[PDB]
Design a binder for this molecule. Structure first.
Ligand code: SF4
Ligand code: SF4
Ligand code: SF4
Ligand code: SF4
Lengths: 327, 326
């Protein structure tokens, strides 16, 4: 029931990638140069079905999983996503189901999602200036559009948090406007440090605004009290606006790596297992495993086996290398 | 550049130099355990200053740049100045530190300075005179150690103060001690208390975390964060907005830092440990060296001990505590 990996970390979260498609082409994720006109995405049948996803989640739930986060791609591009949600909403032990999206399709699908049980979403928005944000998504989408979508999602009863990845030299200046806009809207926003491994290969701080620097900027425009961790392994450092009372987080993904508390399992859109967001090599083929015909007991012992040999710790590895890189 | 099983390099050597002490702290060398009964290590079963020197030279070639002298109380070791001198003559040990309870600084502090000591850390767990004797159990007033800190400063020694905080015992010293050392222009640091429970996770009942520590301080003081002085700096630093004196908070438990841990350790009886915690007896350096061995062979041996190191005791606890809840 509680299974731990080789670093003593229990399994708690399941990340389900639902598609390899996206409606954006953001330079650090799906740059046009690689996913341009030529690129073949997965054939529809090479994706896991909703039934398969639900059966996988049922079994991980028996091994201690309690949260599932839906990702892609842009998840909202996957047709009938609401059916997935309904089926995950029927699984004992799963207490939270989240989704992250760029939000463009929230007016089109939000209600169906909500109807099937979706209550929380994370929206990725890397800027609030329209011209900057188009330079980031590369698909001519205005930030104003996404603001509108966020307000729709809110209006229908979704709780919305925003995630912002900051790259020094690109969206530095988005921090204060975005803090402001979402303080107004009583919405929790979170600024994430950019992860970029140089040639050495430790962390490339060239760009890279750390939590510490970000904080220096913030405190000059807003008056703030830190907010004590709700629980023990909690990733984001939170701070409160004295006003008001509205929270925002800072995610020290590079300056202060958190592999020691990382309880996350991942299934990719092509149905393979990964024990870390980074991975150069193909994972165990869960998809082909279950398609060969297997019992639930068989699946469960395989997921258990996969977690018990997990020792991923990519960021810590980059931190140790970075330190070693001071010869 | 030699690295361990977690890609951590060797950069720091901690040289324990005695097993003796002039205090008898309840939490460390209580009179129950180390009474007047106790036979400490005989002179001859301690590493000599020459083997220590020898071991530093070799570690230095594997990348060690810093040496911290400890023990129980380092200043009870014989002619500590002669060791400090020899260590100071090795390329390329850049730094030598020493942590003491400070009692003997008026006695030995100039000898040490003359020899090359420039930096020290004084352990002081209280500033209140009554409380403090209840801890050190040898009738030593905090004020006595304050005075030693002052003398050490007067002769050029750069001083820092380490306070470990336990919840039921120490709490109320945070603020007075920040006030006293802010006045004197001395960096003080408050360390979180490490203590494992039955379930083998952290025990927070005796902990005042960094985060809670900061709420007590921000009330009494006007404060700014201070950017890490370098990636993976351990102590979180803050400064008084007037004045400009910095203090530190060390998050032992609320945030394990095993991933940056580059510390090799040698005990008073001459054993190597890769971690401050460690049940089993460590590889016996004193017995090795004392047979017939060359520098190249010593180095090979240290190089091998380090390449096989996987210690991460605090992360282990951290992960367990996450597993326990629940
Ligand atoms: S929207 Fe998200 S998934 Fe799509 S390219 Fe941008 S970062 Fe990637
Ligand atoms: S780098 Fe991988 S192992 Fe570390 S916190 Fe991120 S997902 Fe977890
Ligand atoms: S002074 Fe230090 S070594 Fe001596 S008993 Fe106290 S804590 Fe232990
Ligand atoms: S617990 Fe051991 S490995 Fe971890 S930082 Fe402390 S001494 Fe180093």
């Amino acid at each position: 029931e509680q299974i731990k990996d080789k670093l003593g970390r229990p399994i708690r979260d399941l990340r389900l990638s639902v598609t390899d498609r996206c409606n954006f082409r953001c330079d650090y994720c799906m740059p046009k140069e690689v996913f341009g006109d030529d690129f073949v995405f997965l054939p529809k049948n090479e994706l896991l079905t909703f039934d398969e996803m639900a059966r996988i989640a049922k079994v991980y739930a028996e091994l201690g999983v309690k949260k599932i986060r839906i990702t892609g791609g842009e998840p909202l591009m996957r047709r009938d996503l609401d059916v997935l949600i309904a089926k995950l909403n029927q699984i004992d032990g799963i207490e939270d189901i989240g989704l992250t999206t760029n939000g463009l399709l929230l007016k089109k699908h939000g209600q169906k999602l909500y109807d099937a049980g979706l209550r929380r979403i994370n929206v990725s928005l890397d800027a609030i200036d329209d011209t900057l944000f188009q330079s980031i998504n590369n698909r001519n989408i205005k930030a104003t559009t996404i603001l509108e979508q966020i307000d729709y999602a809110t209006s229908i009863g979704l709780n919305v948090k925003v995630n912002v990845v900051i790259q020094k030299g690109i969206n530095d200046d988005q921090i204060i406007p975005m803090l402001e806009y979402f303080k107004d809207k009583h919405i929790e926003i979170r600024f994430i440090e950019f992860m970029d491994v140089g040639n050495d290969n430790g962390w490339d701080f060239s760009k890279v605004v750390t939590k510490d620097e970000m904080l220096t900027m913030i405190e000059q425009h807003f008056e703030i009290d830190p907010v004590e961790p709700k629980y023990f392994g909690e990733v984001a450092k939170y701070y409160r606006h004295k006003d008001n009372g509205v929270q925002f987080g800072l995610i020290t993904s590079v300056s202060q790596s958190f592999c020691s508390t990382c309880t996350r399992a991942r299934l990719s859109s092509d149905g393979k297992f990964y024990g870390c967001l980074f991975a150069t090599v193909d994972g165990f083929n869960v998809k082909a495993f279950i398609r060969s015909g297997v019992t639930d007991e068989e699946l469960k012992e395989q997921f258990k086996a996969l977690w018990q040999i997990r020792d991923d710790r990519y960021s810590d590895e980059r931190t140790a290398q970075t330190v070693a890189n001071r010869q």
